[PDB]
Structures are given as C-alpha cells and as structure tokens.
Symmetry: C3
Subunit: 314 residues, 3 copies
Amino acid sequence: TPRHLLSIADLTPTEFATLVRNASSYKKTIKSDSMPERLTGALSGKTVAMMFSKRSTRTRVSTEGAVVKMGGHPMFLGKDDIGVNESLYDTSVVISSMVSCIVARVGPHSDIANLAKHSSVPVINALCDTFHPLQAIADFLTIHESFAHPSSLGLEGLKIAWVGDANNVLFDLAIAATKMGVNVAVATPRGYEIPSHIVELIQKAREGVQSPGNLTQTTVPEVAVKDADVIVTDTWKIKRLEAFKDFKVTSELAKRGGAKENWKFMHCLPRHPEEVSDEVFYSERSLVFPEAENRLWAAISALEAFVVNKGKIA
Amino acid sequence: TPRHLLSIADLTPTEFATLVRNASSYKKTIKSDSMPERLTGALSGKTVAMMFSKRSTRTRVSTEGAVVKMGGHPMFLGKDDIGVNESLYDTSVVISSMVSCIVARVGPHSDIANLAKHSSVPVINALCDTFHPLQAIADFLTIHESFAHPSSLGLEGLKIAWVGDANNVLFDLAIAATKMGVNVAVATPRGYEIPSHIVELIQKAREGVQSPGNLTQTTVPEVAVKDADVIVTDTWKIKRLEAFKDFKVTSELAKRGGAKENWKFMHCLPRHPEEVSDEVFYSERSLVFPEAENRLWAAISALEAFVVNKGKIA
Amino acid sequence: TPRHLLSIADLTPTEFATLVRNASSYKKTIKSDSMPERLTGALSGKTVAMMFSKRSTRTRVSTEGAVVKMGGHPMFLGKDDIGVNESLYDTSVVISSMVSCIVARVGPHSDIANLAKHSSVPVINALCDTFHPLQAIADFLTIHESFAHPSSLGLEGLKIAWVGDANNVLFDLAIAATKMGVNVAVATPRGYEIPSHIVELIQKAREGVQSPGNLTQTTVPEVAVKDADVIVTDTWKIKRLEAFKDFKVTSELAKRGGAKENWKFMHCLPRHPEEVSDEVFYSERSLVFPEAENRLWAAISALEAFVVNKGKIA
Ligand SMILES: [Cl-]
Ligand SMILES: [Cl-]
Ligand SMILES: [Cl-]
Ligand SMILES: [Cl-]
C-alpha cells in the first residue's frame, strides 16, 4: 500500500518541520551553484504524471521545475487530455501502472480520494475543494526564513491573521500552525465561515502537542489584526462584492486594529485589486514573491519524501 | 532509406517473436529495480516527435514513458499544434530533419504512407484506419505470459475468438496470430465484415510458415466462441445499436456456445458497457489491466528496434 | 543584471559572426555522430520556459530540440496556458525566479521589453512585431555554407534582393547584412515600406564597420533583382491581394530583371502559393529546407551564448 499526501492532517508535527527544514536546506545549496547528493539523478528514467481538471499554470511551473532538478520527466495531462468516457476506477489503475507518481488536481475531494484509493503509486494533492498541502509547506518555509527541537520550527507564540473568505488554503495553513504552536485568528463575513468539519480536524491536530496553536473566529476585521505578526488574504459574484465591504487589507486597517509595528503581508497569488491595496502589496512588508518561489523548494522536498523515500520522512 | 513500422505485415515471424521476447525480458528486469545495459542512455540528447490528429491520451502515456526509460525526450504535437496551412511534403521533410523519430497518428492510411515516404527518420504507426502494430505486440506479450524455437512463441494450436466490429486492431492481431500458428475466428453482423484487402494480407502472411493460423468468418457469435481459449471484443450511431443486438460478451454466451472451461477475456480500452458485461470485465478471467500496461513494454521494444538498432531486430 | 537577445541590433559584428561559426561547427560534429564537450550536460537539472501568445509550431520544434541536446528541459506554455488575469510585472518576476531562461513570443514589442525589464534570467526573443533574431542567424548560417578575419564571415560584396512585404524578418536580416558588408535591395508596394525607425537602426549599425552593407529602396521588382546573388520573399486581405500583383517570385522575373546566372532562393516558411512559383520553390536553386533545419543549429548557439556563457560570447 502506497502512502499519499492529501492534507497536512496526514503529517505529524515532526514530519512537517522536517519537510520545511529540507526545503530550506536544498534552496540554500542550489541557489549557490551546487547539487545535494540525495537529489542527483534520484528520479532518472522515471515519469511523474500531472493531472489537471482546470487551468493551473502557476502550479505547473513549480512541479515541472522540481521534477527536473531530480532528473525525472514531468507529463502534463490537462482538461482537454483526460471520469466521463471511462470509469474512475479504470483510469486510476491504468495510469498508475505506467508512472512513478501522480500530482493531481480535481474538483470535489470525494474525487481525489477515490483516485488515490486505487492508485498503485503515491498520489500528491495539487489542490482540491478543502485542502492544499503544498501551499502550507511553502508558507511556513517563508515564515521560517523571515523570522530567523525536531518537532518544532521554533515559531511558538506567533500570531497569524487571516482576513477574507474561508477556503482550501486557510484550512491547511490553520492545521499546520496548530502543530507548530502558532496562533491563528480568522475574520470572515457572516455566511463564509470555516466549515465545522474543518474545525474538527484543527481540534484533532491539537492532540499530543505540548503548546498547540489557538483558534479565534470573528466577523470584525479590526479584531483579528490585533497583535498580529503576519496578515494574510486571498482572492474572493454580485452577492459577494457587497458582502466583503470592509475586508480589503490596507495600511489604515493595521494601525486602526493595532497590529505589530513590523507586520508582514502574505497572499498566495494571483492577486486581484479587491483584496489588498497597491501600497501594501508592493511595500517592504510584502513577502509575496519569495512566497511564490518557495513553491519550487516545497515540491522538491515533498516529492523526495513521498516518491524517492517511499514515505519514510527524514 | 529508413525502415518504418506501419503494420505487422512488415515483420517476419522471427522478427515478431523477438520484439515480444524483448518486451517480456525488459519488463521483468525493470519491475525488479534494475536497468538493462542495452537501454541506458540509448536515446539521450535525442527527441522523438509524437504527432496526433485526434485526442489519444492512453497512447501518449505509454510512448512518453517508454522514451524516458531510454533517457530521451518526447515532444507532444496535438491537433491544435500541427496538411492544411502547409503541404504534407514540406511538414514531413522539415520536422524529420530536427528529430530522431516520429510516432504518428492520422486518419486515412494514404496519409501516413505519404508522410513516411518523405521522412528521413524511422516512422512508427501509432494508429491509423486499418493498422495498429503496437497493440498486437502488447496483446501477444499478454497471451505469452498467461499461457506460460526462434520463429515461434510456442503458441501453436491456440484459438482466439473475436466478437464485434471488424476494425484496425483485429486486422493486425489476425496477421500476427497467422504468423504464430494461432487460430482466429471472427463474428460480425452483416455489413461489418473484414475488408477483402485485409483478407489478402492475412493470406499472404501464410507464406513460408510450416503451421500457419487459420481464419474463420461467421455471422453467429455462438459459432465463433466454440473451443476458444481467449475471447476479444472492442468499442463499437442509431443504425449500429440495433445491429449488434446479440453481440454483447457475457457469461451466458461462453457456456451456450461451448468455449473452454478457463477462457480468458481481452479488450484494448477504453471500455463502454455495451460490448461486455460487468461480471465478465472484472472477473479473474480478465487480462484487461495487464494488457493495458503491456503497452509500455511494447513501446520500449519497438523504439529500441527501429530507432536505436536502425531496424536490425535482434 | 541579465543580458537579453531582443534583436541583432544588440550584437557587435564580431559577436554575430561568432554565433554563426559556432552553429556551423556544432552542426558538423553532431551530424557525424559526436558531442561537443562544451555542450554535454551544460543545461542539466535546468528548465527553459517557452511562452507563446499565438500558435508557432515550427519555432517550438527547434527550441525544444536545441534545449534537449544540452540535456535541459523545455517547458511549453501556450495561449491557453498563460497580462490579463494578473499584472505583467508579477508574471515576469514569478516565472523567472523558478527557471533558467525564457524564450518568448508576444504581439507588440512594447510587451517583450517590459517582460525582460523585470526578468531575473536571460530573455530570448522568439518573434515579435519588429524583430526575429533567431531567423537572421539561421539565414546567415545558410548563406555562409552555400558560398563556401574574426569580425567577418567573408561575405563582403554579396547582394540580397527582398521582394514582397516589409516585415519583422527582413528588418533583422537587413541589420545583419549591414554588419557583414552585404548589400540589400528591397522591393515593396506603395504603403508597405520599411518603417523609418527601422531605417534608423540600419544606419546606426553602419558605425565602426570599414565596409558596411548598402541599402536600396524600390517600388519596382525588376529593379531590385539586378545582379542579385540571392532572392528572398515571405508570406504576405482583400486590400492586399490586388496590391502585390507583380510581386510573385518567378523564373521569368529573374531573367527579365537581370539577376546572376546562379541566383539562389530563400523563404523562411510556411510557404503559400502566392509569393513564389512551384517551379522556383522546388528547383536546385532553393535553399528552403536546409534554411529550415538551420533553426536547430542557431538555437543551440544562441542558448549556449546567453544562458550557459551568461552573455560572454566566444
Ligand atoms: Cl488544464
Ligand atoms: Cl524531458
Ligand atoms: Cl490531440
Ligand atoms: Cl500557442
């Protein structure tokens, strides 16, 4: 039976800190003109299949680059390429028998689990309705660098403020922060709250950690930002535009709610002009571009762990 | 002048058995964590062009994987990519001068021959109107494993029963079976028979073999299945659905017509629910998934033979 | 700051002759079953991004092949893949941070410069509104072979005649010919002349060359072809077809205008039947197919120079 990566919920706190340290390490070596021994030709002769249900160029760029550093071949199968004209069972058994890994994006989560259930090779979740494991790893890599033993990244007592809609990215970030002893506070409009199944996974993630990260739920943005070390948002039709009125991240929101003097900004891209101001996006406060690049380093770490080390994280 | 693979009609019985033994051999070595010396970096620095006229994801998956095991690069050029805005002559001379091989799928057979006629590198037929060489090699690999000197795979006296429409796949399978001393019987509705040009190639394939495979043509399914070791079908609008009434492969058809006690089932995928029953498809009788995977092993064998060994099969 | 290749206008006469000699050299070695030491694994572990705004299969084929000879990975991002749903600044910073090079095709030239302005890796111009650097290198490689010290390819005093529309390809060819001491004469209909910004770059290219190539502008085709060593055209709706009446390259045009006895023909493909006659296109006068293949050799040279040698041409 192969081990899959569907959500941060599948990782112990130790396993998660290790993926992040590895990405940090590989990044420092490769950006100064060297190759890690563990990675050289680790995937040569081998194919990784990328299955995408809707366009996702950004995700493609980093998976593609990560596979190639390991000397493997990335295979793109988009929405014009591939459960419509053939059962989901069949597609799953057949493709997995001629590749070494599947990186997959689909719509509903029920879809990805069924695929993994019958795959004979490790499946990694590129993005689904409720999870986004690769993004969390990138985001914590970024946090770890900017604020620079085995079961921790030394981040205990930090505060993250999320302002906007409750979605896939927040869900996994929340689960990670809890394991790392980081406090999270979430501001959303009435009707756009964290689903209670997600609150259940966050709570279960508390088990066995001596100082877990705490969860705060609010309707008022000025409340969330209080004493925040980092502020995060995300992309949000007619119904929505009126509802998110005061939810735009601005300089005036930080001072008014009382965030830390040196608060930093994060958004996982692409960015539209509704969620955040130009002044904020392009300030020295903004970790946006390093965060985007850390996708490359997070994919290398994850693929080494799940494909090469067949799931034994070290 | 380069040597092409357009049909099993181009192969001697010895050359065909050798391609099958090679695929079997390479499969056993690679699935137990080793590389054959003959294959390592055999295609490095080199590009193989894949030209597809209509979607064919399944074929792509195996060609892509096969090229990469040899350390080469597979280039996908689909129907939005490439004889409409430029003569067929020109396209053929130009592309072939910057690659080492073309794996091509087109509509009419007249199309593929004209391309090959002016290519300066070996062309392999991925699928056309009347032939499908790669499929036959896979199918005989499968048969050879399940029922486990140079001019034979030791299969003399076996029976294959084809029930359904007469198409490209059957044509090449028939030509192969004849060379291998395997008996084939074909049940089709009135109007959907083997074209007499095909019957002519089967008959010509008889020449020089001491015990050739025999051909049987019928309109009644219960007649074909008599004493059959294997039963095969394939995907089959308004006109057709009424015509194939009794043609659905079922448990009740095997017993009624008198097939062997341990008859096995084969279909080259994708499968729809009209040709065969769920009960049959998923039984221990069904070699469907191994048959699908044997495409990978058959491509490695064929590309080694035609591209690396420049057509000298050994 | 990375060095880009946007136009032949960025190259000294020495740098241009060197790119051409290198392509010639690499071509001779590789076509006789050997690898140049400088090229082997030069790009391994590394990704090159290809960004295409409109279909351009021919360009893809040669870039793809060139990258692979160097052991790198080519990544195709077409018009369904990627400044619409995200600022041009953002796309530029993000993609360039996870690849080693961008080969790009866009519409307006203002577009490509802005991309390069913010890229952290070398950008090469695949084709834009006014330039086509890769084509010029191919064309001069071809000329250099057919008519077979450091600041010259030994072509002084040759004549090139362009008959047809004034476009991107002609512009760069003209700038190259000037640096190489080759004479160019241009026949176009009234309304379809070289833009005066281009005439300005040709004139600036004269500076510092002891025998620069001369420019001639005409409305009559029979005038241009006088004493020409080579004749070139290109693809040219309702308004246009009447205007180019006498502009079709023919046997009868050469004799009538008085071109050299052994004049040669060039067209960068694809060809339509309006610009040139079948008799001319397929004669022994036609360097069309070698010219098409020389794209492969020109890409290897250019990518070695700009990506591997980080812009120090040698
Ligand atoms: Cl897609
Ligand atoms: Cl590759
Ligand atoms: Cl296609
Ligand atoms: Cl495109």
